[PDB]
């Protein structure tokens, strides 16, 4: 199996996480689940940045030690990801010795190589300085040879113009004004600053410089680092320069999605425009929360949350469009055939030829959207197919057909096409929604996991034997 390595940024637990953080982790999970469905050996990482004066200050104010405070915050963050059914293979913490060892070794290496020198940085304090300008041509050469490195492509030309063209100043990579962080082994009054400390989580979590580097040699380089747009230059400039200084392979892609806005702009702990994901999940369910996030933030753009948009998106798309379609279909199979779904024979009805083609066009277009990080376009395309399936009930009028015994075969064809249309949608929604597809597969009585995979969508009409649907249907949402 080809490997695929995906990461979110490590988040700062100076306060509780809100749906902005949730977006990145769900988006990372959508990509991870999608890539596992394509047959990749996937590793998916997330974590926490646990150092700096600010974390020590929060712990003191809470009347706790730094790790005591951090363990409670991280417990809540882990609980949240377990609630969101995030499929992360590991959780990296910068307080862990596996991480601290790498920060220590990397800082001492750069010191030995002459990359780092002692100096002074009113903000007036001593710091080690990283000579990054000597990697400039190498970085710009790498951009030329990897034109899809920054996503969206717009932000690459901002990097070069705003930060590189003026010239990369020597980066201050340590401080002496705080003590909560990784102390430099050579010179312990210095503490490693955020730049080296936070960035190396992506490789420290894979056991880089440990006695077992198997995860590192299997998964590095990262296929995709995802983030919000404001930490892209860390990741586009400083990160590959550090990787050059360590003679390490650079990541393939950095994706910088937009922000989840509120009425007053960016969702943030400091604007007091926070929506707690726990609340949305507890009231409206997991799928509604996951769906809203991925559907409402387009590629290369920002999106806005309002309570009115949320319930609209939840009720119209999930509960009505997909939800009624499933109930309508299972009702009719139970009423006209006593729960026995007739086997698919072929495109018997006149609309079936184009609807079957539409199903395959839906899969192909979905694939293109997913491969180009256009998640909202992928979802909207699946909903056009769901809408058309509801419309196919209205066009065919199965209740009229059920009165003529001569049209029993045609009526069975219509039932089969609804269930197969539903099946196509359920397979395609598996990366996004973790409850509804499984609920749909169980209610239609698809136990075999061969019906739930992407390769089962290559040819329309996989059910040639008659099967029995559920006699006691239920709502799929919340
Ligand atoms: C209102 N909040 C505040 O006062 C605050 C806000 C953030 C604060 C903070 C205090 N203290 C720190 C801090 C200080 C020293 C050490 Br050692 C450390 O580990 C953290 N930060 C960090 C938070 N880390 C973070 O967001 O990691 C993202 C990331 C993930 C993966 C790879 C790379 C980067 C911070 C510091 C400087 C920044 O840029 C100038 C910055 O911009 C993103 C963030
Ligand atoms: N509004 C948001 N939209 C999208 N992603 C976000 C948002 N808020 C946080 N994130 C995710 O978390 C990462 C770090 O976010 P950031 O430091 O801006 O959040 P914060 O907790 O709101 O900070 P602060 O209140 O100090 O400004 C981003 O790179 C992104 O992965």
Cα 230 → chain centroid: 18
Same domain, 125 and 245: no
Alpha-helix residue ranges (DSSP H) falling in 352-432: 352-371, 375-396, 398-401, 408-428
Tell me, in angstroms, the distance from the centre of ligand 1 to residue 274's CA.
19
Is 23 close to ligand 2, i.e. is its CB under 6 Å away? yes
Contact (Cβ atoms closer than 8 angstroms) between residue 101 and residue 209: yes
Same domain, 128 and 62: no
* DSSP 8-state secondary structure symbol assigned to residue 251: P
Between strands 224-228 and 3-11, the pairing is parallel
Cα 351 → chain centroid: 37
Same domain, 362 and 276: no
CA dist., res. 10 & res. 17, Å (int)? 12
CA dist., res. 443 & res. 11, Å (int)? 39
Same domain, 300 and 427: no
- Strand, helix or coil for residue 31: helix
From 305, 331, 359, the end of a domain falls on: 305
Is 234 close to ligand 1, i.e. is its CB under 6 Å away? yes
Residue keyed to tokens 């059914």: 85
Is 14 close to ligand 1, i.e. is its CB under 6 Å away? yes
Output Rg (C-alpha) for the chain, integer angstroms.
26
CA dist., res. 97 & res. 187, Å (int)? 19
Total residue count of the chain as it appears in this document: 478
Method used to determine the 3D structure = X-ray
From 305, 324, 349, the end of a domain falls on: 305
- Strand, helix or coil for residue 215: helix
CA dist., res. 375 & res. 428, Å (int)? 12
Atom 12 of ligand 2: nearest residue by CA position = 21
Is 343 close to ligand 1, i.e. is its CB under 6 Å away? no
Between strands 340-341 and 303-304, the pairing is unpaired
Same domain, 417 and 344: yes
Contact (Cβ atoms closer than 8 angstroms) between residue 234 and residue 30: no
Locate 106 and state its tokens.
Answer: 């990397």
Same domain, 361 and 422: yes
Locate breaks in the chain with C to N over 2.5 A; list the residue preceding each.
121
Torsion of CA 437, 438, 439, 444, to 10 degrees: 90
CA dist., res. 438 & res. 430, Å (int)? 8
Same domain, 19 and 141: no
Q: Please identify, by atom number, the ligand 1 atom nearest to the C-alpha of residue 94.
A: 19
Number of domains in the chain: 3
* Domain that includes residue 444, residue range: 306-478
**3-class SS letters over 108-153:** HHHHHCCCEEEEECCCCCEEEEECCHHHHHHHHHHHHHCCCCEECC
Same domain, 184 and 198: no
Residue keyed to tokens 């249309």: 421
Same domain, 155 and 177: yes
- Strand, helix or coil for residue 410: helix
- Strand, helix or coil for residue 351: coil
Is 16 close to ligand 2, i.e. is its CB under 6 Å away? no
Contact (Cβ atoms closer than 8 angstroms) between residue 89 and residue 3: no
From 193, 228, 261, the end of a domain falls on: 193
Locate 359 and state its tokens.
Answer: 């199903």
- Of 292, 142, 293, 128, nearest to 221 (Cα)? 142
The sign one gets for the Cα dihedral 192, 193, 194, 199 is negative
Locate 219 and state its tokens.
Answer: 């998964």
| Number of separate helices (H) and strands (E) present in the chain | 20, 16
Atom 5 of ligand 1: nearest residue by CA position = 54
| Ligand lying nearest the CA atom of residue 94 | 1
Same domain, 324 and 265: no
CA dist., res. 112 & res. 451, Å (int)? 57
Atom 7 of ligand 1: nearest residue by CA position = 12
First to last CA, the chain: 36
CA dist., res. 390 & res. 376, Å (int)? 21
Distances (CA, A) of 282 to 86, 269, 278, 313: 16, 21, 6, 17
CA dist., res. 108 & res. 254, Å (int)? 27
* 117 φ, ψ (degrees, to nearest 5): -135, 150
Between strands 254-257 and 260-262, the pairing is unpaired
- Of 430, 427, 426, 416, nearest to 469 (Cα)? 416
Same domain, 336 and 425: yes
Residue keyed to tokens 């959780």: 91
- Of 432, 372, 363, 370, nearest to 87 (Cα)? 432
Same domain, 86 and 120: no
């Amino acid at each position: 199996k080809e490997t695929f390595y995906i990461t979110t940024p490590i988040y700062y637990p100076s306060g509780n996480l809100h749906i902005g953080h949730a977006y990145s982790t769900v988006a990372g999970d959508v990509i991870a689940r999608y890539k596992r469905m394509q047959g990749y050996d996937v590793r998916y990482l997330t974590g926490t940045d646990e150092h700096g004066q600010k974390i020590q200050e929060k712990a003191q104010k809470a009347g706790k030690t730094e790790i005591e405070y951090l363990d409670e915050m991280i417990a809540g963050i882990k609980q949240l990801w377990a609630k969101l059914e995030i499929s992360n293979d590991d959780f990296i913490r910068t307080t862990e010795e596996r991480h601290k060892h790498v920060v220590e070794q990397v800082f001492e290496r750069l010191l030995k190589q002459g990359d780092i020198y002692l100096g002074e940085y009113l903000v007036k304090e001593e710091s080690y300085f990283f000579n990054i300008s000597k990697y400039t041509d190498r970085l710009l050469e790498f951009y030329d040879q990897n034109p899809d490195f920054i996503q969206p492509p717009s932000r690459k030309n901002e990097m070069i113009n705003n930060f590189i063209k003026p010239g990369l100043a020597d980066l201050a990579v340590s401080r002496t004004s705080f003590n909560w962080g990784v102390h430099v082994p050579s010179n312990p009054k210095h503490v490693v600053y955020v730049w080296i400390d936070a960035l190396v989580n992506y490789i420290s979590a894979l056991g880089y410089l440990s006695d077992d580097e198997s995860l590192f040699n299997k998964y590095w380089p990262a296929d995709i680092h995802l983030m919000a747009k404001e930490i892209v230059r860390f990741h586009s400039i400083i990160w590959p320069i550090l990787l050059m200084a360590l003679d390490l392979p650079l990541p393939k892609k950095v994706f910088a999605h937009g922000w989840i806005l509120m009425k007053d702009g960016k969702m943030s702990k400091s604007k007091g425009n926070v929506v707690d994901p726990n609340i949305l999940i507890d009231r409206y369910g997991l799928d509604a929360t996951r769906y809203y996030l991925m559907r409402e933030l387009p590629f290369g753009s920002d999106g806005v949350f309002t309570p009115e948009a949320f319930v609209e998106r939840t009720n119209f798309d999930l509960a009505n469009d997909l939800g009624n379609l499933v109930n309508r279909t299972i009702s009719m199979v139970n009423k006209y055939f006593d729960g026995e779904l007739p086997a698919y024979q072929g495109p018997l009805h006149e609309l079936d030829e184009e609807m079957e083609a539409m199903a395959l066009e839906t899969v192909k277009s979905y694939t293109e959207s997913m491969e180009s990080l256009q998640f909202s376009v992928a979802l909207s395309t699946v909903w056009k197919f769901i809408s058309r399936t509801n419309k196919y009930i209205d066009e065919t009028t199965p209740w009229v057909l059920a009165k003529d015994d001569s049209q029993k075969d045609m009526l069975g064809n219509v039932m089969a096409h609804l269930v197969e249309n539903i099946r196509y949608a359920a397979v395609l929604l598996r990366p996004f929604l973790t409850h509804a597809p499984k609920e749909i597969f169980e209610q239609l009585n698809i136990n075999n996991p061969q019906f739930m995979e992407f390769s089962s969508l290559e040819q329309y009409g996989v059910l040639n034997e008659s099967i029995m649907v559920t006699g006691q249907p239920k709502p799929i949402f919340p």
